[PDB]
Write a protein that binds this ligand. Structure first.
Ligand SMILES: Cc1nc(C)c(CNc2nc(OCCCc3ccc4ccccc4n3)nc(Cl)c2C)s1
Ligand SMILES: [Mg+2]
Ligand SMILES: [Zn+2]
Length: 322
C-alpha cells in the first residue's frame, strides 16, 4: 500500500554534494536546516556518511529509502518532512558529541528512527483520533500515531530495494528494528514524563548503568524526546517561526473539533492566541527545561541544548512582559 519514490528522485539524490560553508555549522547543535529545503535529503545522506561512513548502507538503497520516507510525510504545518530532518540532525549532533557511548547498530538505527519518527502524520493528536474514533485509534489503542509511524517505517523497508538493513545478520536486523521501534514509541510525549522521572532517580542514586539494556533504552528514549523538541534549542528567530508552524497545526486540529461542535482546549483554539507566550513559558518550564537538564546530566556534551533552551525561555518571558 506504501508510497515509493520514482527512479529519478533517488538517482538525483545519489549525485548531490553538500556546500562547504555548511560543513562546520551542521556540526553545531543550533544548526537550522530551514533555509536549505532542496538539500534536506542530501543533508541526511551527509550525516549518515559523516557519522557512520560512506559504506554503512548501499548508496542506491539509502537514496531510495530517504526519497520514499519524504513522500510518506504529509503537507501538514508542523509534523512534516522539515521536522523529520530537523529531528535527525539533532540526533546526528548528539551522536557525534557522544562518539564512544553508542554501538554502530544504535548509531544507524537512531538516525533512521529520527527520520521516520512522524511518518504519515495527519496533523492530529492521539486524543483527537481516539475521541472522534478514527480508524487509526481502532488499530492502535495507545501511542496511536507512534505505532503507525513504526508501521510506516517497516512497510517502507519492505519495498523493492528499500531494505538498507538487508546486509545485516538476522540477529542484528531484529536488533536494529527493535531500537527503531522503541525509539519511535518514546516520541509519544505522554511517555516522556515517567521516563525522565525514572532516569533522574537512577542518576541521583548512582544506579544508572549504560551496560544495562533497560537503562540504555530509557537514555535513548530521552534522546528521542530531546531531538523531538529541539526547535526550542535553535536561535530565537528560528524558534519563533517554528512556534507559528506548531500552532498552525494545533489550531487546524481545533478548527476540526469546532466544526463538530466540540470546544477545543485553549492550546488548540485560535481565538486564544494571546495566551501563546504564557503557554510557551509553562511548556519550557514543565517539559523542555527538565528534558535538557536530565539529558545534560546523563550526557554532559549535550549541554549546548540546555543553554539554547534557557536562552529561548528568557525570550518568551520578554514577550510576556513586552
Ligand atoms: C503540533 C505539536 N504536537 C506536539 C505533540 C508538539 C510537541 N512539541 C512542542 N509543543 C509545544 O507545545 C506548546 C503548547 C503550549 C501551550 C499550552 C497552553 C496554551 C494555551 C493557550 C495558547 C497556547 C498554549 N500553548 N511547544 C513546542 Cl515549542 C514544542 C516543540 S508540537
Ligand atoms: Mg510524533
Ligand atoms: Zn516529532
Amino acid at each position: 500500500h506504501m508510497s515509493i519514490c520514482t527512479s529519478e528522485e533517488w538517482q538525483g539524490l545519489m549525485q548531490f554534494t553538500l556546500p562547504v560553508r555548511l560543513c562546520k555549522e551542521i556540526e553545531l547543535f543550533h544548526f537550522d536546516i530551514g533555509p536549505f529545503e532542496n538539500m534536506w535529503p542530501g543533508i541526511f545522506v551527509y550525516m549518515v556518511h559523516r557519522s557512520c561512513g560512506t559504506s554503512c548502507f548501499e548508496l542506491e538503497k539509502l537514496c531510495r529509502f530517504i526519497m520514499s520516507v519524504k513522500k510518506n510525510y504529509r503537507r501538514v504545518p508542523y509534523h512534516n518532512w522539515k521536522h523529520a530532518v530537523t529531528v535527525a540532525h539533532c540526533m546526528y549532533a548528539i551522536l557525534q558529541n557522544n562518539h564512544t557511548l553508542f554501538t554502530d547498530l544504535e548509531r544507524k538505527g537512531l538516525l533512521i528512527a529520527c527520520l521516520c519518527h512522524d511518518l504519515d502524520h495527519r496533523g492530529f493528536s492521539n486524543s483527537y483520533l481516539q475521541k472522534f474514533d478514527h480508524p487509526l485509534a481502532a488499530l492502535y489503542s495507545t501511542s496511536t500515531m507512534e505505532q503507525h509511524h513504526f508501521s510506516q517505517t517497516v512497510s517502507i523497508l519492505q519495498l523493492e530495494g528499500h531494505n538498507i538493513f538487508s546486509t545485516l545478520s538476522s540477529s542484528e536486523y531484529e536488533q536494529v528494528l527493535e531500537i527503531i521501534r522503541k525509539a519511535i514509541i518514546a516520541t509519544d510525549l505522554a511517555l516522556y514524563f515517567g521516563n525522565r522521572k525514572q532516569l533522574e532517580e537512577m542518576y541521583q542514586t548512582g544506579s544508572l548503568n549504560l551496560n544495562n539494556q533497560s537503562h540504555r533504552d530509557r537514555v535513548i528514549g530521552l534522546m528521542m524526546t530531546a531531538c523531538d523538541l529541539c526547535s526550542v534549542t535553535k536561535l530565537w528567530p528560528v524558534t519563533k517561526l517554528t512556534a507559528n508552524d506548531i500552532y498552525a497545526e494545533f489550531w487546524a486540529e481545533g478548527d476540526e473539533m469546532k466544526k463538530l461542535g466540540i470546544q477545543p482546549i485553549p492550546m488548540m483554539d485560535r481565538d486564544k492566541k494571546d495566551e501563546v507566550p504564557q503557554g510557551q513559558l509553562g511548556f519550557y518550564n514543565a517539559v523542555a527545561i527538565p528534558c535538557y537538564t536530565t539529558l545534560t546530566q546523563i550526557l554532559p556534551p549535550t549541554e549546548p541544548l540546555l543553554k539554547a533552551c534557557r536562552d529561548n525561555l528568557s525570550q518568551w518571558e520578554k514577550v510576556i512582559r513586552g
